[PDB]
Write an enzyme that holds these catalytic residues in place. Structure first.
Site, mmCIF file in Angstrom:
data_model
loop_
_atom_site.group_PDB
_atom_site.id
_atom_site.type_symbol
_atom_site.label_atom_id
_atom_site.label_comp_id
_atom_site.label_asym_id
_atom_site.label_seq_id
_atom_site.Cartn_x
_atom_site.Cartn_y
_atom_site.Cartn_z
ATOM 1 N N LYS A 70 0.821 -1.208 0.000
ATOM 2 C CA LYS A 70 0.000 0.000 0.000
ATOM 3 C C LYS A 70 0.864 1.271 0.000
ATOM 4 O O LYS A 70 0.559 2.240 -0.707
ATOM 5 C CB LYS A 70 -0.983 -0.036 1.167
ATOM 6 N N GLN A 91 -4.550 -1.366 9.502
ATOM 7 C CA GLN A 91 -4.509 -2.684 8.882
ATOM 8 C C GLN A 91 -5.071 -3.741 9.837
ATOM 9 O O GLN A 91 -4.622 -3.874 10.977
ATOM 10 C CB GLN A 91 -3.091 -3.041 8.436
ATOM 11 N N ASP A 108 -10.092 3.974 3.781
ATOM 12 C CA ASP A 108 -10.240 2.525 3.632
ATOM 13 C C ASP A 108 -11.679 2.054 3.890
ATOM 14 O O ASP A 108 -11.977 0.876 3.720
ATOM 15 C CB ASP A 108 -9.289 1.798 4.586
HETATM 16 N N1 LIG Z 1 -7.948 -2.201 6.892
HETATM 17 C C1 LIG Z 1 -7.727 -3.220 6.057
HETATM 18 N N2 LIG Z 1 -7.261 -4.401 6.521
HETATM 19 C C2 LIG Z 1 -7.028 -5.443 5.695
HETATM 20 N N3 LIG Z 1 -6.563 -6.599 6.172
HETATM 21 C C3 LIG Z 1 -7.266 -5.288 4.330
HETATM 22 N N4 LIG Z 1 -7.086 -6.264 3.434
HETATM 23 C C4 LIG Z 1 -6.049 -6.302 2.571
HETATM 24 O O1 LIG Z 1 -5.123 -5.480 2.581
HETATM 25 N N5 LIG Z 1 -6.086 -7.357 1.739
HETATM 26 C C5 LIG Z 1 -5.293 -7.595 0.686
HETATM 27 C C6 LIG Z 1 -5.196 -8.899 0.193
HETATM 28 C C7 LIG Z 1 -4.440 -9.164 -0.948
HETATM 29 C C8 LIG Z 1 -3.789 -8.136 -1.623
HETATM 30 C C9 LIG Z 1 -2.976 -8.405 -2.905
HETATM 31 O O2 LIG Z 1 -2.708 -7.471 -3.667
HETATM 32 N N6 LIG Z 1 -2.713 -9.683 -3.197
HETATM 33 C C10 LIG Z 1 -2.037 -10.068 -4.462
HETATM 34 C C11 LIG Z 1 -1.145 -11.298 -4.244
HETATM 35 C C12 LIG Z 1 0.220 -10.867 -3.711
HETATM 36 C C13 LIG Z 1 1.244 -12.007 -3.703
HETATM 37 O O3 LIG Z 1 1.157 -12.877 -4.605
HETATM 38 O O4 LIG Z 1 2.104 -11.978 -2.789
HETATM 39 C C14 LIG Z 1 -3.103 -10.387 -5.538
HETATM 40 O O5 LIG Z 1 -4.200 -10.864 -5.171
HETATM 41 O O6 LIG Z 1 -2.792 -10.170 -6.730
HETATM 42 C C15 LIG Z 1 -3.921 -6.827 -1.162
HETATM 43 C C16 LIG Z 1 -4.675 -6.557 -0.022
HETATM 44 C C17 LIG Z 1 -7.767 -4.062 3.874
HETATM 45 O O7 LIG Z 1 -8.020 -3.863 2.548
HETATM 46 N N7 LIG Z 1 -7.978 -3.054 4.741
#
Ligand SMILES: Nc1nc(N)c(NC(=O)Nc2ccc(C(=O)N[C@@H](CCC(=O)O)C(=O)O)cc2)c(=O)[nH]1
Ligand SMILES: NC(=O)c1ccc[n+]([C@@H]2O[C@H](COP(=O)([O-])OP(=O)(O)OC[C@H]3O[C@@H](n4cnc5c(N)ncnc54)[C@H](OP(=O)(O)O)[C@@H]3O)[C@@H](O)[C@H]2O)c1
Ligand SMILES: NC(=O)c1ccc[n+]([C@@H]2O[C@H](COP(=O)([O-])OP(=O)(O)OC[C@H]3O[C@@H](n4cnc5c(N)ncnc54)[C@H](OP(=O)(O)O)[C@@H]3O)[C@@H](O)[C@H]2O)c1
Ligand SMILES: Nc1nc(N)c(NC(=O)Nc2ccc(C(=O)N[C@@H](CCC(=O)O)C(=O)O)cc2)c(=O)[nH]1
Ligand SMILES: [Cl-]
Lengths: 282, 282
Positions: free
Chosen positions: B53, B97, B120
């Site tokens: 992020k 987060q 968020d």
């Molecule tokens: N406050 C808050 N807490 C949280 N826990 C979240 N979730 C929260 O960040 N999830 C999340 C999950 C996956 C990815 C992501 O980009 N994943 C990649 C995979 C990355 C990899 O392969 O290592 C994808 O799906 O393309 C980004 C955010 C959120 O959005 N807000």
């Protein structure tokens, strides 16, 4: 035959201890709890329901501050009026009777009511807090329905609830309250393409459409719990949003119309006013 | 074969526009937009996503204020940190987060974030407002999903959307956003009975259970739009909450994992931060 979910009898029972609580508070503090009711414009039904709510207040030892505004009231005028009541320490709850005249931004006015005084549960904040499991006054009619279901030992957890209607003060809060009680929840509305099919899957069906007997008896699942939140005046007995003639052969339990959801709408508002007053004065 | 809902491409496209907007803002005001990221404790996935992020912030010409608090942080300490960020005019958005250490009241801390900085979309107020059609930043992942569907011309109005999972920041907002788009919406969870049958009825399925491939491929309706919001690292490629092996034969359109919902989670947060900065610095 279906169990009659007797909202009239439940409302009467609940008012018994509400009266005790209010008389205790008044003896303790020397102050009478007040619900401010806001009636804007000339809707006859709104007038009738506001009077019924005022009467209910007085039945449990409280009183109402009657605010009546003309049909042509603007959003700005109503907001100012609500801000007066928010800062009035003699007023413990605020009701804005829906639907206000069409020129008024009702949502803006609902949201102007302070959370502490949102005893009818109309604010977005109140809704979000309820939806996320935080303490809040719930929208009166759906909170009243949950009370009916709970007092009548109706099983909710794991059941498929279908809510027909998604209004801000009825369908949406109803859906979130049932979800909170661990029902699987389906929310339908005017753009639902297969309404009869979905209703026939409902273990618990809530009619919240405001259209006389729209939900057909033929769509009701055998053994379903049937909740009719509608009311439409008619010659010698009004009808709700669901066809209830012969429902006793179909439902495991049902709310009659009249005498079901209606009385508990009023009771819920009054209970939550009692709660607000206790917090404010006690 | 099914349409690949390419969240990675969409995210990149959106970021090109955010970049020019941020650079214009910095040129006009001399100030850089700031997202405050709060990471509490040492959860690995949390650390990774906060890093991603922050990287996204800098790709579009903004920066992050990285707040890192220890495992043993109390609710009171976290509330105090959030209030400092609320009062800091140079901070435009605040991310907490999830999941914070379990001794912390996460809901209370989410709700301490000012609505204006709730980029968020985690506040009860923000959820309530969105549910009732009022302006508010939407929870990042479900808002990103809505964008994916919209920008791929996926029909939503009148379709039966089934959301599996009802979490505060994912499932619940997802359902309310789909409802606002005129889908018929069913919300399922761990107490849901006949889940395979409910999913089979779905025109749009959203997997939000946080369990590897729980939603089985034979539960999916032929021609369904399949949205997988899960991610579970695995050797040789991570998987989501849905069996997507051979999904091209079944779905009309689907979000791949990885590279679908994930990138749009991040980009939605950054976009809403840019919007917050534009409002604050204009
Ligand atoms: N406050 C808050 N807490 C949280 N826990 C979240 N979730 C929260 O960040 N999830 C999340 C999950 C996956 C990815 C992501 O980009 N994943 C990649 C995979 C990355 C990899 O392969 O290592 C994808 O799906 O393309 C980004 C955010 C959120 O959005 N807000
Ligand atoms: O104004 P108002 O009197 O309509 O009250 P309202 O406050 O708009 O509430 C009525 C609710 O019933 C829904 N509804 C109306 N007709 C329906 C139908 N034929 N099938 C399923 N749902 C229906 C509406 O759908 P919408 O929310 O789509 O109007 C709305 O959610
Ligand atoms: O922790 P986390 O990452 O899982 O997020 P979370 O915050 O626990 O949310 C996960 C969601 O998935 C639901 N879920 C878990 N197992 C399920 C199952 N077998 N069938 C249907 N729904 C299920 C949960 O139901 P509940 O809300 O009933 O726990 C919850 O709503
Ligand atoms: N803010 C706000 N606006 C609203 N419009 C309502 N609804 C809102 O008052 N409804 C309502 C409907 C029926 C009855 C009622 O008790 N009806 C009787 C029938 C008597 C009659 O209607 O003449 C019954 O069902 O037994 C009471 C309240 C509300 O609860 N809050
Ligand atoms: Cl009386």
């Amino acid at each position: 035959m279906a169990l009659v979910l007797d909202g009239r009898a439940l409302a009467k029972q609940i008012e018994e201890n509400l009266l005790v609580r209010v008389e205790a508070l008044k003896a303790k503090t020397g102050r009478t709890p007040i619900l401010a009711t806001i009636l804007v414009g000339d809707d006859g039904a709104s007038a009738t329901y506001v009077r019924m709510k005022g009467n209910a207040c007085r039945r449990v030892g409280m009183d109402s501050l009657k605010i009546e505004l003309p049909q042509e009231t603007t959003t700005e005028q109503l907001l100012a009026e609500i801000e007066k009541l928010n800062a009035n320490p003699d007023v413990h709850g605020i009701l804005l009777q829906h639907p206000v005249p069409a020129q008024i931004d009702e949502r803006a006015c609902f949201d102007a009511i302070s959370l502490a005084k949102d005893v009818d549960g109309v604010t977005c904040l109140g809704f979000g807090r309820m939806a996320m499991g935080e303490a809040a006054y719930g929208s009166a009619t759906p909170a009243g329905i949950m009370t009916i279901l709970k007092e009548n030992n109706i099983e909710i957890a794991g059941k498929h609830a279908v809510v027909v209607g998604r209004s801000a003060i009825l369908g949406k809060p109803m859906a979130m309250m049932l979800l909170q009680a661990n029902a699987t929840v389906t929310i339908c509305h005017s753009r639902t393409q297969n309404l009869p099919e979905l209703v026939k899957q409902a273990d618990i069906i809530v009619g919240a459409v405001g259209k006389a007997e729209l939900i057909q008896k033929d769509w009701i699942k055998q053994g379903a719990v049937v909740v009719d939140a509608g009311f439409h005046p008619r010659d010698g007995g009004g009808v709700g949003d669901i066809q209830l003639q012969g429902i006793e052969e179909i439902a495991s339990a049902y709310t009659p119309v009249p005498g079901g959801v209606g009385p508990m709408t009023i009771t819920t508002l009054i209970r939550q006013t009692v709660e607000a007053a206790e917090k404010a004065l006690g």
